[PDB]
């Protein structure tokens, strides 16, 4: 028992000098060598502390005391640590395409998928480590395997013209269904639905078939510049705050 | 067992004293070595309780009355020493870089990482002592390792120069890709996509290729200052929150 003890101490003294070979808080690895060796002494004496220790059953409330605050103590690193595993069998996303959640702020492009953490880049290029504890319980979204982007707009109408809205929604609706850019078995609203209190709103809600954030911003864009000559085509020119005064 | 007690009594003591060398609170360093007394010897007459204590199976369920007690109460301390562990090892950030969360507010540069704590300086020069355990439970994001920085910016146009927000969106996009401060393997995004209640806003979103601070926002202010006239090389003239009033 002592002759183990011995050959183990210098094998993590050759671990602690392997540890100063990088460069790791060398004044630090003999604290962390130090909780090593009483950690690895004291489950021996929980172990073999019936041969030549006395009072087994002591012993054994008292590795009750330490273990159970050991297991709860460390809960989220062991959880963090299952959770890995569980993303390395069901993986919900690949590497390279950006997740995101409505629960928490963990969007960017992952990078890699370590056991403890998952690495993800943000759209500001930073990396974002976020501890895999929380992909077992908060709804990831992967719009990296989103098939269509999405264009959705209020207009606004300047709330007088309500006798045009018809002719509007309907030219709006028909340049859609003609644009080159926008998908056609997808959804395709474009209705009067909201009655704001400054402006008569029209829904515009439809898909492009790129997915690809820079021709999507150019179609909505192309989109948003036929709508505004279609709404100046008749006269509607959208709508401000526009409240009364009422002066005295 | 007596004479351990005493020997352990001394040498506590010694300690006391060794306590009272440096500045540490005479009045409570008794009270200390009090608690370290009594401890020590409700630990040994649980364990050695039995060779000369009675009521073995009694005491079992006393200790695990009191261990399942201190188990659970000192959770929090083992895990921000047990977590800390992690840092020595899976260590997600340096020492001389700034980190930040998205979810609480550590932001600021690191300065030191102890076992129990972790020492960071914040951005008024303050330190901020966090605790470890937020660090296996939080996304911890670090901008130290940013590879760009990034400008971004909704211009606003004044709502009825619609017909001039194509040539603008355009002379602004390629006076980014022409800027030498502005990478250009990244993102470089210049689009008419919001059209907000009092403006045509653009979207303009780019990537510089320096990760300092001081040359970021000097690149962002020539870049905003290119902005401004090209915006009014046209007649634009951006826009303010522009009510009607509709007097009566």
């Not at 003294?13 to 130090?34: H, L, P, V």
């Not at 629960?103 to 943000?122: C, F, M, P, S």
Request: proline content about 3%; charged content about 20%.
């Amino acid at each position: 028992a002592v002759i183990l003890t011995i050959k183990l101490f210098l094998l993590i003294n050759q671990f602690e000098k392997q540890q100063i070979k990088k460069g790791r808080d060398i004044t630090s690895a003999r604290i962390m060598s130090r909780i090593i060796k009483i950690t690895i002494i004291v489950v021996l004496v929980l172990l073999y502390g019936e041969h030549f220790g006395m009072s087994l059953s002591g012993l054994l409330t008292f590795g009750g005391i330490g273990g159970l605050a050991v297991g709860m103590a460390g809960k989220d690193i062991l959880s963090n640590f299952f959770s890995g595993i569980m993303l390395y069998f069901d993986r919900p996303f690949s590497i390279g395409d950006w997740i995101r959640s409505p629960d928490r702020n963990i969007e960017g492009t992952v990078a890699e998928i370590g056991w403890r953490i998952t690495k993800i880049t943000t759209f500001d290029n930073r990396p974002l480590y976020v501890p895999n504890s929380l992909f077992s319980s908060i709804s990831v979204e992967n719009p990296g395997r989103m098939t269509n982007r999405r264009i959705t707009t209020t207009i606004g109408l300047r709330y007088e013209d309500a006798a045009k809205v018809g002719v509007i929604v309907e030219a709006v609706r028909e340049m859609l269904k003609n644009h080159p850019a926008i998908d056609q078995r997808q959804t395709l609203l474009v209705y009067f639905n909201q009655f704001a209190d400054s402006s008569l709103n029209i829904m515009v809600y439809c898909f492009t078939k790129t997915t690809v954030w820079a021709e999507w911003l150019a179609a909505q864009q192309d989109v948003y510049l036929k709508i505004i000559d279609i709404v100046q085509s008749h006269g509607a020119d959208f709508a401000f705050p526009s409240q009364t005064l009422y002066m005295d």
